[model samples]
Target: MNDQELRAYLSQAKTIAVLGAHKDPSRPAHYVPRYLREQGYRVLPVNPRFQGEELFGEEAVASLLDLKEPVDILDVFRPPSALMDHLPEVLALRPGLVWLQSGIRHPEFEKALKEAGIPVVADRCLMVEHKRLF
Candidate 1:
């Protein structure tokens, strides 16, 4: 989808699951979610390595299934190589949208998700799109 559609989705959705989020500011994980939060989005960090650690005021979850609340968006930062391995888990989460953040789309994975009726946004940055729409 384009920036307008993405912004509409963001305005309608509240919570976002930020996969591969990092505690460090240097990482896109930290900054992207920060931008989303600034836009009034509730970001839930998902990373096993940072599990139980509070990053951006939310505890990091090892996986989407570990979350107690419904996630409206799934933002991925992990590389393409890992996308397929995460398919089942990501598919199981049943979020409103599955996003393969800028430069991180796996052809098969996108096909799998789309075939399964999940909306996918590939090779895009939520932060950039958010800026464009706002």
Candidate 2:
């Protein structure tokens, strides 16, 4: 989605799936979702290391496949190279939107997501956008 579309969507989105969310406070993966949670969005933490641990009243999951609740936004924090390996599973969930955090972008992945009719925001910081747009 474009900046306008993304702003509109964020206005209504209630849940966010934070893929690769981390425990380290210094990391973007950890702090961005924390900020989202503070803003009242349900942040579903997804990371192998934190799986089964609780954060923001939700348990961390290892993958999207394991999440039972609906996720409006799938905010990814992994490197560009690691994204494709998780596409099949990501596609299966069919999230309302996929967000690749700043410094993470892959043309093929963006193309595939666009072709699938899924809105994508890449090479951007979700936190920055949220504060700027919302």
User: What's each prediction's TM-score?
Assistant: 0.94, 0.95
Residue-pair clashes per prediction, in order, are: 0, 0
Q: How well does model 1 score by local distance difference test?
A: 0.88
lDDT of 2: 0.89
Error of 1 at 54 (Å): 0.3
Per-residue lDDT tens digits of candidate 2, residues 1-134? 47697788898889899999988889999899999999889999998888899866788889899999887999999998898999898889999999999999999988999999988988888899999997
Local accuracy of candidate 1 as per-residue lDDT tens digits, 86-121? 888888888899978988878899899999898988
Give per-residue lDDT, candidate 2, residue 28. Answer: 95
- Model 1: worst 10 consecutive residues (lDDT sum): 1-10
Residue 133 alpha-carbon offset, candidate 1, angstroms: 0.9
The reply for model 2, stretches above 4 Å from the true place, is none
Q: Which clashing pairs does model 1 show? A: none
The CA lDDT at 12 in model 1 is 91
Q: Which stretches in model 1 have alpha-carbon errors above 4 Å?
A: none
lDDT of each: 0.88, 0.89
